[PDB]
Amino acid sequence: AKHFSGLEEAVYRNIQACKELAQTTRTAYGPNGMNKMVINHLEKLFVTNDAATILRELEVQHPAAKMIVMASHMQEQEVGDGTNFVLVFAGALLELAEELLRIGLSVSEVIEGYEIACRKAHEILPNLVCCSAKNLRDIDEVSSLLRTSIMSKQYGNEVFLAKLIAQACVSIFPDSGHFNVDNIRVCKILGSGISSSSVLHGMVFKKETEGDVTSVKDAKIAVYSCPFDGMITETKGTVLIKTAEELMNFSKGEENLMDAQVKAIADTGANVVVTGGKVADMALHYANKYNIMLVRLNSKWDLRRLCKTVGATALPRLTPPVLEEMGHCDSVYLSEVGDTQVVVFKHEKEDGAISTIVLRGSTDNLMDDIERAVDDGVNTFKVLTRDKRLVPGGGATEIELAKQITSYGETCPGLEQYAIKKFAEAFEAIPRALAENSGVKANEVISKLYAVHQEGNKNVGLDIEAEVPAVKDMLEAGILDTYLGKYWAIKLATNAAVTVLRVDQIIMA
Amino acid sequence: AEVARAQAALAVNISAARGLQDVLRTNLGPKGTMKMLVSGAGDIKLTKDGNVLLHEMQIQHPTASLIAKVATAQDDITGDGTTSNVLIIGELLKQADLYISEGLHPRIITEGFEAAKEKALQFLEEVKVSREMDRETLIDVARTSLRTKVHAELADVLTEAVVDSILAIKKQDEPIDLFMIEIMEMKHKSETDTSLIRGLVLDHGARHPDMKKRVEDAYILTCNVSLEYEKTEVNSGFFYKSAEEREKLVKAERKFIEDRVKKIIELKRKVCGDSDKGFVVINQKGIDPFSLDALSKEGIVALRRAKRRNMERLTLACGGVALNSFDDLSPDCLGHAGLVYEYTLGEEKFTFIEKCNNPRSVTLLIKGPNKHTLTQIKDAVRDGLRAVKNAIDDGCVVPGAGAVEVAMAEALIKHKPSVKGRAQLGVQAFADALLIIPKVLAQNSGFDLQETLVKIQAEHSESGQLVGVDLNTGEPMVAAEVGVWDNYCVKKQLLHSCTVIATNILLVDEIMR
Amino acid sequence: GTDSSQGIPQLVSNISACQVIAEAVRTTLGPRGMDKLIVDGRGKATISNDGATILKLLDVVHPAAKTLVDIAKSQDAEVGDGTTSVTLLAAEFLKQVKPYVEEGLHPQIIIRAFRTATQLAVNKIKEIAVTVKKADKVEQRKLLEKCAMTALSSKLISQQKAFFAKMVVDAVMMLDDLLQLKMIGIKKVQGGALEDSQLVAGVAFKKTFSYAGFEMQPKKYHNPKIALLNVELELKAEKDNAEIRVHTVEDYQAIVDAEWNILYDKLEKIHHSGAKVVLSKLPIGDVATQYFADRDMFCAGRVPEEDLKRTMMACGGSIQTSVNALSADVLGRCQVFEETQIGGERYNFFTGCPKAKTCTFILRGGAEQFMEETERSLHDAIMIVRRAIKNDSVVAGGGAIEMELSKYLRDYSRTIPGKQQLLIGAYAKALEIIPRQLCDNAGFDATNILNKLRARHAQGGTWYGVDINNEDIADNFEAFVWEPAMVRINALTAASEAACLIVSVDETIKNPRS
């Protein structure tokens, strides 16, 4: 396995990986994609409409498949959505080259036809910007632009969810322009429907919460991964189950030992004590009396989201905490998150790195589906802090590119010339994808997007205008792209493609 | 056991090595291709390089063991042309196959190989010319030498970086680099980006809110095994012979943390003035946060997580004394660096030591988070550093890209190796094996490989001019004015390694398992 | 590795698998509808009616099998009736789109054709629906008799329905704000008032231990203190088992008595903590039984756990697994205790409860298998009347609306299409399959029965359906066959939804490589 012979790696392996890239963003992505069912190593159905999640879930033994996955890892890192755009564009561009190979062209010849032309397309790429607009303080400005980001991974409530995601990234960082890396951690509470999803600033422990506040002016923490069944700075006690008479003696002494624990934590500075494990019953009886806050039974990912944002790591034992393992938060307060009472912290720009959006729905896969769309819009605001330049919607951009690139090919002449003719044809995979997302023919849509010659605004959405296919203004519709977001999406797709085109056979010892 | 004693025993041997060459025929050129290589546990590696594709992973061939031996010595002596040496012997078996296919002795073919080299070794003196130690002379060689081994866009970003690294010697006579070779990988946004900085880069810098960032006349205190012990340069375990012996050690350890940061700060008042001169602590191991308070408030740039390999080149980079202790041994046990600066880009903090007493250790700061790029961009470095060092070690560089191959084959005109014609045999398969480097490129390019190869020969006979094959068109051009120039240290060594193993193949007419 | 297959041959494999799984839950639901039998695991053979009961019991061998479970679970959680009908209609959508997608005709306008035809359906159901609690009485309890007596006339009985319907109405009015099945549960004997049932407004106990003394104990109180225990009471308390010992003479008579002093001390811990009647799930010892006769207290072991759950909700008490109580709000209490042996089985009747929310029927039929269907005859009237109260917006039952909605939406297939008449026609094709199956599980020719209804649907009226007790065409409004409007509206939004799941997904990815 993983190494074969017989003109497989060059001609045959690459088109095979493109079939895996086929129907992965070709009906699962657009203005409105369609679901795909994935079952992970933990048994559960998963819906996917983002490229990077399913391909991280999908295991491949094909090394040719592994290249573009790493490129899409950059395009989540640099842009966000459009990793879907990376697949079908690189998937088309690889499949167009073997017909040039049946002519008899070399690999590096048609690589060079793609190298100078992606340089050429990146020069045309400033000429595709239409209606630049930016307000880093206006939710109404951002909810219009982040609509098409969450259109691409939803079908239902766009207007409900675009107002939420525009509210968080603005209000978590009122100094926008040097916006942080990530500032939203999701809160999946199963229950009430999608209209119960909302934005809560600061950390939300939507798990169980006991006791009450000690102070709301401060919310210092000593986050511990260890239970409180007798764990102390001295020799760590456990719940004595070896003898019933020892269970009675340990029950009488626990509140006094819980007294030694809560004063060891609060005097160093804490009002909330994070409990990953359990708390003993008498230990829980005293914490109500001392009025210290305990939050029991948080997950490992819940432990990770806390330890990232406060700079305090979890501890395996009880101690007077060091300075490097205590976190500070602005306020801690009990407020209903989704109209059910769990605790919610306060993290301003003095604390940063998180503003939660609670995910509520009758199905966790819907909660998993809205988990897909919000991850791109976080980076899209970080894109928006970089550029204010707006490109119109997907596919309407590619058809203006294809005309000049075809005109650029004949001005070259060579055998790179024919690759530049193929390079314009990889642009048309995006109206091929949206026609296949609608389940309609592509060349009728391709014939329409040719003939308009205004062509830079004209495409067909996932609409009843796509029932019988007919063009529309993507820019007027509210379906938008941007300058840098399309720039890296073309740059990284052309980068991984010519390298995975360049590959040869593998031998293994 | 079983035996194979026939001409078929040679015929199986010559068949295996030609097919392994044709796999590598995809490589060796800017128009040649990178080869994807996957490890046993799986790791995507795109290399065009000969030794890495050969020595790491291979399939079962007895010839594969043979060609690993001779490409070792090419990698040992030069470190370049590990792509180039395979293509000669593949063709060298091919025309020599034909005469024994007609039916001739394997030894009469063998003896003409030696006279083939000797007529060409004297021609190697003719075809090379004295070229300069100019940077721009080495610019033309480096970008040419990289494109035969790695990609051209890889050559363009490294042409300025490789030539300036090897130039830092003071006429040190060595054919490959030794201390210039330092590769610091870095997670970037750009997979392809390359930064050459003089001096050594530290793999991990350090930051305290009171710690300084720019220091000048930085007196380095090179540091090692840490505050918890005292007067140690190597780690040690704990005493388990008695229960009290475990306890009495760790109660004293916090006192030695106090004592050893005390020796460092009191040396800063003595030697650096009050705070008038820079002071740098380079610890091999972790920094305790109590000393992170005590050092940084003094005005000391303390550093964390160095390698012991970095410790040894730091002794060369400072040029003075690089210690491994915290305590005050002597104030003149401090090496001197006129400039030490920690620049932070990306996730990682990178500390530079500059104003070096020895311009012998430089470091290429290597960008790219994706490993398949980060492997490949690192692989372009090591072959680039050695090959151009061969060009600066040689006072005479050969003009390459195949222009010598038609030049020697015409100069190997026969009846001069005439003793019985058996010397004319081995020179004739030799001259046809010369032309594979013009054959591979016009294969990889257009301008069909042997159709234009005779057009190279028709032009080279005109006025004796050296004419080569274009790397992007396959068209004839003069190698000198274009400057497509190969390393003479490759080219001189190439005759020796290719002669001896094809000799050894003709000595093998029996194989036993 | 990881299992994966894309596209139409996976999608045809998707649409075909789900229809075969749906073949059980298609063909169910009613008196002339159906009632289950499966064998799983050890050989545990069970009998059901709800597919959502047994879809949790049956395995999932497809993701399509996993798709049907929660959709059936969603219908079972709200109503409990019609749990299979949502899983019926979903795969019935896929059958007529199957020749389309095998031609290659596969839009993703298929899924929006589901939702658009859903909105036209669920609006038409709501606008034709009539609130019956407001318009068609001011007391609406005699109204609920005619619906419950119809629900009793469907399964088994035809003469006991007048005697039983007011007992159903008077039980549900107490259980309003609740939907529990252990608070409407029916108990069974033969030997009481035969072919007559009774309604108690409190807590009744089916399996109570006797034959260790019940006439030696006061079997009635007028202020019981109920110990809802779960602790086994022994015939005698123990001694050690290591270095335990008999014969010599001095420590001899004591250790035989010392087995007996420890038991009654623990039994006195029940007594002075407050108890006059003591119940335990685990068996109470026979010599311990007569010690409650010594303090003149009633006791019974071997009690089902669901009986103790009735007491804690009506008395405000709780169940215990201790030997000492500390409050009377964990303990149970009433104002009348009465033990009554109806049918030769010992019942503990709790009347005068502090809440009296639990209702229990003590059913006597003419036989045992007769009483099995008689209980499920009564259970149907409990399910439909609780559902009729919570939603006054009520249409006819029997799929009478669907055949109208079949023809209603094919008129839109006449009206709207660019290509959509293939979809909405297939949507309207699957609607009439439910009363078709309700004729087909009743066994008779739906093509005769359904086609006669559409002629009277053509003149006017949508309540025209099937009276399945005779299998004739009938106006199910005037034939009293009903079900509330939102039941179908919850059914339609879930049947179209899983159908939207199948059309959107053409690939199943199994990451741990099965």
UniProtKB/Swiss-Prot annotation, chain A:
The lineage of its organism: Eukaryota, Metazoa, Chordata, Craniata, Vertebrata. The keyword Ubl conjugation applies. Keywords: Acetylation, ATP-binding, Cell projection, Chaperone, Cilium, Cytoplasm, Cytoskeleton, Hydrolase, Isopeptide bond, Nucleotide-binding, Phosphoprotein, Ubl conjugation. NCBIfam families: chap_CCT_theta. Belongs to the TCP-1 chaperonin family. Component of the chaperonin-containing T-complex (TRiC), a hexadecamer composed of two identical back-to-back stacked rings enclosing a protein folding chamber. Each ring is made up of eight different subunits: TCP1/CCT1, CCT2, CCT3, CCT4, CCT5, CCT6A/CCT6, CCT7, CCT8. Interacts with PACRG. Interacts with DNAAF4. Interacts with synaptic plasticity regulator PANTS. ATP binds at residues 82-84, 152-153, 394, 481, 486. GO terms for biological process: binding of sperm to zona pellucida; chaperone mediated protein folding independent of cofactor; chaperone-mediated protein folding; positive regulation of protein localization to Cajal body; positive regulation of telomerase RNA localization to Cajal body; positive regulation of telomere maintenance via telomerase; protein folding; protein stabilization. One of its GO terms (molecular function) is ATP-dependent protein folding chaperone. The modification Phosphotyrosine is found at residues 12, 487. It catalyses: ATP + H2O = ADP + phosphate + H(+). ADP binds at residues 29-30, 82-85, 151-153, 394, 481. The modification N6-acetyllysine is found at residues 300, 382, 448. InterPro entries: Chap_CCT_theta, Chaperone_TCP-1, Chaperonin_TCP-1_CS, Cpn60/GroEL/TCP-1, GroEL-like_apical_dom_sf, GROEL-like_equatorial_sf, TCP-1-like_intermed_sf. Mg(2+) binds at residue 81. It is linked to De novo genetic variants in nearly every subunit of the TRiC complex, including CCT8, have been found in individuals with a broad spectrum of brain malformations, and clinical phenotypes ranging from mild to severe epilepsy, developmental delay, intellectual disability, ataxia, and other features of cerebral malfunction. Its main location: cytoplasm. There is a cross-link at residues 206, 236, 242 (Glycyl lysine isopeptide (Lys-Gly) (interchain with G-Cter in SUMO2)). The gene is CCT8. Its EC number is 3.6.1.-. It is an enzyme of class 3 (hydrolase).
Curated annotation (Swiss-Prot), chain B:
There is a cross-link at residue 241 (Glycyl lysine isopeptide (Lys-Gly) (interchain with G-Cter in SUMO2)). GO terms for cellular component: chaperonin-containing T-complex; cytoplasm; cytosol; extracellular exosome; microtubule. Its EC number is 3.6.1.-. GO terms for molecular function: ATP binding; ATP hydrolysis activity; ATP-dependent protein folding chaperone; protein folding chaperone; RNA binding; unfolded protein binding; WD40-repeat domain binding. ADP binds at residues 29, 81-84, 148-149, 401, 486. Transmembrane segments: none annotated. Mg(2+) binds at residue 80. The modification N6-acetyllysine is found at residues 189, 277, 355, 367, 378. It is found in: Cytoplasm. It catalyses: ATP + H2O = ADP + phosphate + H(+). ATP binds at residues 29, 81-83, 401-402, 486, 491. It comes from the Eukaryota. It is an enzyme of class 3 (hydrolase). Its main location: cytoplasm. Signal peptide: none annotated. The modification Phosphoserine is found at residue 195. InterPro entries: Chap_CCT_zeta, Chaperone_TCP-1, Chaperonin_TCP-1_CS, Cpn60/GroEL/TCP-1, GroEL-like_apical_dom_sf, GROEL-like_equatorial_sf, TCP-1-like_intermed_sf, TCP-1_chaperonin. Keywords: Acetylation, ATP-binding, Chaperone, Cytoplasm, Hydrolase, Isopeptide bond, Nucleotide-binding, Phosphoprotein, Ubl conjugation. The keyword Signal does not apply. One of its GO terms (biological process) is protein folding. It is linked to De novo genetic variants in nearly every subunit of the TRiC complex, including CCT6A, have been found in individuals with a broad spectrum of brain malformations, and clinical phenotypes ranging from mild to severe epilepsy, developmental delay, intellectual disability, ataxia, and other features of cerebral malfunction. Belongs to the TCP-1 chaperonin family. Component of the chaperonin-containing T-complex (TRiC), a molecular chaperone complex that assists the folding of actin, tubulin and other proteins upon ATP hydrolysis. The TRiC complex mediates the folding of WRAP53/TCAB1, thereby regulating telomere maintenance. Component of the chaperonin-containing T-complex (TRiC), a hexadecamer composed of two identical back-to-back stacked rings enclosing a protein folding chamber. Each ring is made up of eight different subunits: TCP1/CCT1, CCT2, CCT3, CCT4, CCT5, CCT6A/CCT6, CCT7, CCT8. Interacts with PACRG.
UniProtKB/Swiss-Prot annotation, chain C:
Mg(2+) binds at residue 81. GO terms for cellular component: cell body; chaperonin-containing T-complex; cytoplasm; cytosol; extracellular exosome; microtubule. It is found in: Cytoplasm. Changing residue 368 to K: Found in a patient with developmental delay, intellectual disability, pyramidal and cerebellar signs, cerebellar vermis hypoplasia and hypoplasia of the corpus callosum; uncertain significance. ADP binds at residues 30, 82-85, 153-154, 398, 483, 488. GO terms for molecular function: ATP binding; ATP hydrolysis activity; ATP-dependent protein folding chaperone; identical protein binding; protein folding chaperone; unfolded protein binding. ATP binds at residues 30, 82, 85, 387, 398, 488. Keywords: Acetylation, ATP-binding, Chaperone, Cytoplasm, Hydrolase, Isopeptide bond, Methylation, Nucleotide-binding, Ubl conjugation. It is an enzyme of class 3 (hydrolase). The modification N6-acetyllysine is found at residues 56, 239, 309. Pfam families: Cpn60_TCP1. It comes from the Eukaryota. There is a cross-link at residue 419 (Glycyl lysine isopeptide (Lys-Gly) (interchain with G-Cter in SUMO2)). SUPFAM superfamilies: GroEL apical domain-like, GroEL equatorial domain-like, GroEL-intermediate domain like. It catalyses: ATP + H2O = ADP + phosphate + H(+). GO terms for biological process: binding of sperm to zona pellucida; chaperone mediated protein folding independent of cofactor; chaperone-mediated protein folding; positive regulation of protein localization to Cajal body; positive regulation of telomerase RNA localization to Cajal body; positive regulation of telomere maintenance via telomerase; protein folding; protein stabilization. Its EC number is 3.6.1.-. It is linked to De novo genetic variants in nearly every subunit of the TRiC complex, including CCT7, have been found in individuals with a broad spectrum of brain malformations, and clinical phenotypes ranging from mild to severe epilepsy, developmental delay, intellectual disability, ataxia, and other features of cerebral malfunction. Belongs to the TCP-1 chaperonin family. This is T-complex protein 1 subunit eta. The lineage of its organism: Eukaryota, Metazoa, Chordata, Craniata, Vertebrata.
